[PDB]
Ligand binder design. Structure first.
Ligand SMILES: *C(=O)([C][N]C(=O)[C]([C][C]([C])[C])[N]C(=O)O[C]C1=[C][C]=[C][C]=[C]1)[C][N]C(=O)[C]([C][C]([C])[C])[N]C(=O)O[C]C1=[C][C]=[C][C]=[C]1
Length: 215
């Protein structure tokens, strides 16, 4: 059977969102992993609140930045994250307004992935599901991508600036690839997604800041 898994066609992933002018890609990513696990456990997908993370994870910078692990730690220590209808995305920073009633998910910790480990990452996405990863997105070839398996010898594994979410992997045609869910509306890349090279020596440092929440 094909060495591939694509969570989109299993109801594990939600519609592609646009982050706007807010640097909350880390919030979208975190929430993306939370939704994947939700579906795994409860069997039903629901849209979680990225804004809830933006305004409440004080350990992070809000629209300035943040780490997914910090957002995980928050849903565990606060025990609950609202749904989108319970705490809509306003495209900017505002006072934390967690509405306990609107809670739609919980998590009991989180697990990282060995820095620079693509084999282990494959195993995670295969075993656990949608993993939150961070890559170097500061590159024009990446931004105007439209189709195919993305690869550029200048993607810097040391400059992780954009958080994203791995929804699977595969071989489009000869080339191994990580199926990525970006957060720049669905007008970007291939309807919101982008296939990135897999096994071509830790391309873009996709496996350097990976993690997954435990549920
Ligand atoms: C993300 O939101 C980061 N934002 C983006 O990558 C881009 C910015 C652009 C300059 C490429 N997107 C953006 O601004 O959206 C605008 C837009 C919307 C729709 C269409 C087009 C454009 C938030 N990420 C962070 O804050 C990250 C967190 C993780 C990557 C760690 N912070 C970061 O990378 O800096 C700190 C850091 C230090 C050490 C190691 C890793 C990270």
């Amino acid at each position: 059977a094909p060495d591939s898994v694509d969570y989109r066609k299993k109801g594990y992933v939600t519609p592609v969102k646009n982050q706007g002018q807010c640097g909350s890609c880390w919030a979208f990513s975190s929430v993306g992993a939370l939704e994947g696990q939700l579906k795994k456990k409860t069997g039903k997908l629901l849209n979680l609140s990225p804004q809830n993370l933006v305004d409440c994870v004080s350990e992070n910078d809000g629209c300035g930045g943040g780490y997914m692990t910090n957002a995980f730690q928050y849903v565990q220590k606060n025990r609950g994250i609202d749904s989108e209808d319970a705490y809509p995305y306003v495209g900017q920073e505002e006072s934390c307004m967690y509405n306990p009633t609107g809670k739609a998910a919980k998590c009991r910790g989180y697990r990282e992935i060995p820095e620079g480990n693509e084999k282990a990452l494959k195993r995670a996405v295969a075993r656990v599901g949608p993993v939150s990863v961070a890559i170097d997105a500061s590159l024009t070839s990446f931004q105007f991508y439209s189709k195919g398996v993305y690869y550029d010898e200048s993607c810097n594994s040391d400059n992780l600036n954009h958080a994203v979410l791995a929804v699977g992997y595969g071989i489009q045609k000869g080339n191994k690839h990580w199926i990525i869910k970006n957060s720049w509306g669905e007008n970007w890349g291939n309807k919101g997604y982008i296939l990135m090279a897999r096994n071509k020596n830790n391309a873009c440092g996709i496996a350097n800041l990976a993690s997954f929440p435990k549920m």
